[model samples]
Structure formats: C-alpha cells, structure tokens
Target chain A: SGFRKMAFPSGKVEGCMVQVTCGTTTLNGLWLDDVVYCPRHVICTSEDMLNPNYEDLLIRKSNHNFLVQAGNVQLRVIGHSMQNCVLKLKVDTANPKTPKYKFVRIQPGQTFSVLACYNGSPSGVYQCAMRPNFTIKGSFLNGSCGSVGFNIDYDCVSFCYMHHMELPTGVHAGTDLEGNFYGPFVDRQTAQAAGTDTTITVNVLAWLYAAVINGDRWFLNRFTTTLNDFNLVAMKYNYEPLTQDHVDILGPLSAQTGIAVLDMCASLKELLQNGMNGRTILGSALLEDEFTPFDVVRQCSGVT
Target chain B: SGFRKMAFPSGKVEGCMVQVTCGTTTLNGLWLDDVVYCPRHVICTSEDMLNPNYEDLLIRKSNHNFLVQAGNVQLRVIGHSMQNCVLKLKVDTANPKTPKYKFVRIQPGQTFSVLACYNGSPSGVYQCAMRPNFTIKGSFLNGSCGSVGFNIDYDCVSFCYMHHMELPTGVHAGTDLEGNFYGPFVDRQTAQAAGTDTTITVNVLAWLYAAVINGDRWFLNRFTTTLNDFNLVAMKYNYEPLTQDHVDILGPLSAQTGIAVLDMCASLKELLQNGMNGRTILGSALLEDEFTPFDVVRQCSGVTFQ
Candidate 1:
C-alpha cells in the first residue's frame, strides 16, 4: 500500500498532523515539524509523483502569510512524489546583510516540519524562504521548484504579540500590562459594551493616530519615535493595533489636541504683535474665563 | 509782618492754597486753582517781586516727572513775585502728530491745576508739557522760562491702572484674569511665598523664557509672538517681569521638554532608517524593556496619555 495509517500507543507523535494518500491507501499521521524533517515517512501516489502542485506540497497552520509570534516560527513541507527532495530554508533577520539557512532531505511520500527560533534580541521581523535545495541535483522529481516565503514578526514584549493578534479581528486576547484581559471583540464598542476601560481603549487609539497622521516634521518624527517605542513595549506584552472602536475614540482626541496646539501657537504670535491687547483677543475666543489654554491641552491629552 | 496766617470765614476756598506776602504783611490764603488766576486780588510786595525763583513757581502733586493712570492727568502751576504767568499745557497722544493744548493765566502766589483726558480708543501713553504762554507776553517773568514735560500712561482697562500702582516697589498690583490679586513684594519669590500659584508663575516664566531665548529664527519669531501676547495679558493684569523664582521654575521645564523633543526627533530619524528593528536599538539605550520610548516623552509632558 502506498498509504497507511500508523497508530501510536501513546496517542502522541512529533510534529503536526497532515493528511496524505498513496495508491489505494490513505493515511493521517504526525508530520515531522522541526528545523528539518524527512519527507519519505509520509504517503505519496504515482499521479502526485508525475505531476505535483508546488503550492500544495506545503501547508501553514495559520492562513496568514505573516506569522508573528515570540521566540520561533513554524512551517510544514511535504514531498508528494516517490522521489528524494532536498529542501533549503533561508531565514532573513531585520538586518539586510546577513541571512541564516538550513537544509533537509525528504524521502518519497513524506513530510518535513521546520521550526526556527529567532537569535536576535528585543524585537525584529524575520523573513523565511523554503525551496528545493538546488545543490542536490537528482533529489527533486521536478527539474525546478518554486519557493515559499513568509514573515515571522516577533517582539520581546509579549503584549505586542497579543496586540498583533488583535489587529486582524479588532479583538484583544491575553492579559495586558495592567493585568486586564479582553475576550473576542467585533469592535472597540463591543469591548466597551462588556465594560472595558474607556481610557485604555482611547489610549490605544491615540497611539494609532500618532502613528498614522502626517504632522509637522518635527512633531511627526517625535511621534514616530514614540510609536516605535510603544510598539516594542506592546510586542513585549503581545498587544495589538487599535480596533475601529479605539479609532473612534482616539481620532477626535488627536484632532482636538493638534488643533489646540495650533491655536496656542497662533495666540502666542498675536501677543507678540499686539502686546497687552493680545490677551483680549485670546480671552474673547474662550468660552469660559476660568479655563486656561493649558487646561484645554490637558483635557485633550486625557488628563483631568 | 512779612508773613501772616489769614483765617477764612468759610475755612474753605475754590482753588489751591497759596502763600502770599506784601512787604509788611504776609497772608496764607487759597489761590484760585483754575487754569487762570489774578495776582493783584491776592497779596504781593515789591521787595518779594524783586527776588523770585521762576523754577519754584510750579509744583506737581506726585512730585514725579511721569503720571500714569486711567483717564485724566493733573498738575499744579503757581505764580511767584506778583507775576502774571500765562500757562500753556500741551497733551500728546500716542500718535506723533496732533497735540491738544490748554491755555490759562496764574496770578502771583496762585496755583492752577491742569487735567487732560485721552480721546483715543482703548488706551495709550500721553506726553504732556507745561510752559509759559508766549501769546500772553505779560505772563513771562523771565526771558528764558523752561517748559516742564511729563508722561501720562493710561489704559482703557481699569485694572491696568491698579497694576501700575504696584509698579513702584517692583511688585504686581491688581487682579489678574484669573481673579487673583497680587500685593507688593520684593520679588517673585516673595509673591510665591505669599501663596502665588506655581503653575501660573511657571507659565509666566515660560513666556518670558520664550521671549528671551534666541533660537532658530522662525522659532524665535513664533516665540516672540507668543511672548508678546502673554506680556500684553500680563500688562493688562499689571504683572511685572519674570522674577528669579519664575526663571527657576521655567528654565528646567523648557530645557527638559526641549531635550525630550530633540531625543524623540532623533529616535524617529533612526526608526525611519532602521525600520522596526530601530526599537531594538532604542531599547538597548533604555534601562528596562518595560519602559517604552513614549514613556520618556510622557514624563516630559507630565501626561500619561493613557
């Protein structure tokens, strides 16, 4: 039989489970998911050996092309033919100059699992590519093979990882720095509906606004630095981007703050020109005499 | 008697009090304090007329060269040695052109008070001069009579006048827009010690710092504008210059905020160059992974932003 199901008395095996078939036999077993694996252990059919779909030879646990997590990245590569295949995996770190590589040989009708841990520190984006090792001439059934590449984004901060997870669904998972855990949310409104802290949501939204908006060059630059710093911290905490509800709260706050800063600067300019009369001008613009310009800024910043 | 004290039946007069003498008799009586007065109606002696100090003929109430107030300005012009002194008062508004003039005659030993109100809108500094009116030739006791000039500073805002009152001792007077009134003090330290709001003091100090510091030309210009605006407000509230205490508070805040802003800008530039990995570099500089770069700025601004 080209395909067979192997039973484990312990009910456990190494690597991930993958479905395979060869001839009249079909089998489901644990694929070797590691930095390297032997593909010959899995099942393969003659039709698959003759004509193979390059993309079908591999599968990812998560459908996303970018796999962002802390510590390591995982992938599964299968050999669908009755021939030896040499697989090469290359890991590119944030540094453009250096790349790490690993090689493995897969026998006919077998699967190879690869898991590579990051060697860098703090946080970085690692891009990995897997393809047939061209150096081994007679290994691959096909003369040529396409490469599979994906991004592994990781941060030391666990919250950042959690934050990334929430980006797609606009829902937060896991505990935040303040020991607050959020379940699945359709939007920020849903989280708030469930009694999430409004301040936390607004803060997150404000962070996003700072990242996206184009402001004065100096201000924008400072904001970018601020974003990068928070992102790393978020990464350490495994947090995610702002949900729609977060944006709803933050957008107005950011806009209001920016406007207030502009107004303050303008009033200062007018004072230079008109001397004491400038106060009259400024006073005339205010709704209440009790509140100072500083008070307005503090309010915009979410300060009492 | 060369001088005698004369008692008035009513014990009151319509004008200023003046001292007069007529050789054998000297009488103390009220001289008409109007713009014009006659010397013959009062008392005058030939011997006293022979020796007279033209400078002593006029006296100002405050005895100061400058009179700053809200509306009208007052002065006293006196005649000596039975002289018929024709007084001319000229008031100059902020405009360099048109000046207002009032003419009056003062009898010997008589005092005349002059008051002038500004016609300009809002408020302005007025310059006033008093001299002998040449048109009335008899009023000139000396061939060369010097004119006396003083400045009258006033504002439309009445509180400004109150603030001016405290200026002599270098303390700010009057209630500010915040409705906080300040009293006389040796310096800002005294004011603060007397329970001035630190935030307000620091803000004012920051305003002064912005005005004084010379930075990039555009920044300086913008800062100047800011300073000017606040200064006017302070002026309206009768606030004084930046005190040592103000500078002490403001200097550090500005310096810290400026440095933080600079650091943030630099980090941003690095981020643009290095991408996400820039955080790693930034983290390398920080004491702990727990603290984000935003924390630095938040500390600077005194806001959590959270």
Candidate 2:
C-alpha cells in the first residue's frame, strides 16, 4: 500500500502494530521503520533536461591537448569528456597550419580520461577543439584546450622544470663525490676570512652574491669547473678586522642573504654623505644590536 | 561534625532549624545557604585560576607576542626563569645609549605589572632584559627596550601608517592614473611569461622563485622592479615593422604609474648571463607553440597600448 501507519505502546519500534491502505482497501500489518530509499538512482525531471547546464571544461583538461615529456613518450591527451563526443589530437609543425580535434564526446559531470601515446619526431604546438555546436546540425559540444612543448634530456635522467637547476656529478651538497656541503655561505666569518684580503678588482662581492641568488648546486658546479682555472679552493675562513674592503666584501654577502644590499649600502652611503664619520657610523650601538629590525628578519628569514 | 551532611536545596531557610559548632560548643540556630553564599560574594578557591596551556596561547597568535587589545590587558611572559629582570620602554633612536633595566629581581610564574604608555614612539622595538648576563632578552616582555631604528611615516597628517600601497590621488579602475584595473602582475605569471620560449631557462626561473621564498616585501618590491626592467625595457631592440617604429617613437605616457626602473634591470642582469648568442637563452620548451621567443603582449600590443 502507498500509505501506511503504525502504532507502538513503547517508544521503540519493536513489536509495533500497523494498518495499510490500498486503493479504498485497508489491511492490518506490522510497520518496519528501519528501511529508507536509496539516493544515487534519483532521476532528473523534464524541466532539468530541457536546460542542461554544461560544466566549464578547463583548457588544461581538454582531450586534444598534448604535453611533451622526455623519453619515448611523445604525446599525452589529459582531459575529460570523451565518452560519445568526437575529438582528435593533431600536431602542426609548419607555419599557418592549425592542429585539429575530431569527434570526442564526454559525459556530463565527468572528466575526459587522460590518453598518453608515444611517437618519434613529434614536434610542434598541439591543441584540442570540440566540433558541432549544440545549435548546429551534426554539431557536438567542444571544450577549451591547452598544449605544452617537448624537450630532450641530454645529460640528466629527468627533465628539469621551472625553478630547478642541475649540477654536475661530485659538486652539489649530497650529490658531491667528496660530499661537499654546498650552501649559502651564511657564516660571513668563513667567506670573508678566505677571500677578505685578496684584492677583488672586479665586482667579486657581486659575483658571490650572484652565485647565491643562483642555486648553490649551479654555483658549485661552476666553481668546481672554474676553481682550477682560478687556482682557488674551497676553504673555511675566520673572522678578522672589519675594514672598508671588508665591508665591501660583506656587502654582497648581506645582499644574497635576502637583505637589500643596495638599501643598506645606500643608507650607509647616505650617512657618510651627510658628514657622519665612519667610526661613529660603524660603531653605533644601535647598528650592532638585534631585534630592532623586525621586517629585516621577516625578509631575510622568509618567514611568512 | 566534619562529616555532617549540608544539603544546598532550592528553598529558603530564614528561620529553619540547623546545628552550629563554635570552638567546642554546639548551638542550635536557623540558617540559609542562599543568605550565607550570596551571588555577588561567591568567593572561589585558588584552584579556580585556570592557566591556559601552551597550545591555547600558540593557536592563532603571533610568533613573538600577542598584544591583547582589551580584557584585563594581560601579558604572559613565557620563557626560562631568571633571578633579575629589567623592563623598559624607550625611544628608538641612534643616540640613546642607556638601558633602563639594570638588575630588577624576577622569578618564573611571577609577573610584574606596568601601565602601557603609547607616547614614546610607535615604530620602536621593545624587549625584556636580564641583568649581568644581559645576553638573554625577550622582545615580547620589553616594549621596544633595545630597538635601534624606527620606521617613520611622513604621508599622513598624524604620521599614520598606510598598511598597503595607497594609490596615487586620482587612481581608479579602467585607465586610471596608476592603471590599477589592468593588473598588479604577480610571480607565477612573471616566471611563466619571462622564460616562455627557451632552453635551460628553468634555472633562471628557479633563481627568481627563490628570491620570493622568504616572502620579503622589500625583496619583492625590488625584485619586481628588476624583472620589469630586464624583460621589457633593458634590452636593445629595433622595431620590426614600420608601424612598430612609429609606436616606439611615441614614448611612454602615464606619468603616475609606480615603477622602480634600476632595481628591475639589475636583478635581471644578475640572473641571466651573456651567452654566445649575445642575447640570453632561457630553457627550451617542447611544444613549439608554447615557445614565445619575445614578449608578445609587450611585443604584439597595438600602438595605443604600446
């Protein structure tokens, strides 16, 4: 019966009595309240079917798009919506030639499965297009697509991505054959001691700072290769006297340490320019103290 | 008598029967629980002082200290104990040499109270100091006691701090003085756009990305300035088409746009090296179309936008 009711003396549903009605007929029965309807099989009404709102397909997830990875794997189509739709992946090497996407239909509320394929001599910009506008005859819904370029790995096993630098064998910290710990010369004491008195005619401080801004791995690789040429070796140094040359040498170190080398230099320069004596400028109790520059620590430490 | 049951029921006892003991003498009298323990004078024991745990203090609070705007104005000084403590608030200037706290005695679990004075200087750094071994100090405990410098603001009438960059006087959306509508282009776009078409440019991208690793506003400020100059203006170029040359001769218009020129150029030069090509080569891209050799938006924009 469509409509039914049950009564119980206690709050519990066990041992309850009930009555059922079926089209002008009533029957006695026991009511079990434990069961309920399932949700997944619910169907949409005609009103919803009339205005089918299509989900926005991102350019990165389109089927016809291709990503170029190293090794034998050539083309990869990573996207959604390829069930009943017509979609094709194409590569255009020549100028004034555009790649195309054939019929690729994808179901609503689901992504097109990623398709990875290998091909030799696969080069050029690859893109995806959806054909057959819903309003046009023999039309299908097309989604926006994106493409990426391919590259070869000559020396390394994995292709380097943006914000990564490669180093030669026996150079970088853990990778070094001799296990050299290569990192930013945070200890200004050692860096200054080794190269302090060595007259730097060029912007040696700038080069050192530049080395740090670049990764230590890259710097170590270059240093290792160029060390023999310069007759220089990696040596730890000790702190000595602080002089103008020393300041100049330390200037770049401070800069690479995330302190604005120029701003600090400019501030010191401005003080000197304003007739403030060097001894007074350098020996100021305030200059030597800590915890004063909250932003400085925030900047140098990269503390969010 | 100690084990006697004293029930606190929800009823009046102005003249009820009760037993009372004074010293060793026992007396019969009327007593009410409500009359003795009134709502206003409900004295609690020492156990009622519930000290918040470290997790409670750490959650959603700043690293060094948490400045309570209201509610008892409590300042919790959490650290290793010391015999002597000195707290002082002083102006943050170069000439001030004296330290106010010489040797004031303090122990763990004990707090000294002092009125907060906002008069000295808003930008100074404050700290707490212990005597003799003045080596250890807490900035949270001392209000800018040892700060060396101050960040002075001259823009506002009362020297108020404008937290974010304030737009120049008449700036608005859609072609305002500062061009605020277009974009305040950030790193992800800058990194992707800068090394779009190249080989071995990933390292170049990494170098810039690392600079931003620490989230230094000043570093970001200088870095942005550097990238803009290196990418758009520093390199030498001959306008390709005849119309391109005409736009080049027109000159940059908007006078109010905020751009720091030299820092941007310096950062780029520091990043890229002069290769055999004389022009810098960024990392190579696999898809030829993804390769954008030149700054297209900068390269392909119309004369008006150029």
What TM-score against the true fold does each predicted structure earn? 0.15, 0.15
Q: Compared with the true structure, what per-residue lDDT tens digits does model 2 show for residues B162-276? A: 0111122111101111111112311110111111112212122222222222121122234443333444432332111112322232222111112232332344344333311
Q: What lDDT score goes with residue A303 in model 1?
A: 22
Instruction: List the global CA lDDT of all models.
Output: 0.22, 0.19
Worst 10 residues of 1 chain A by lDDT: A1-10
Model 2 segments more than 4 A misplaced: A1-202, A214-219, A222-248, A251-304, B1-306
RMSD in Å for all candidates: 37.2, 35.1
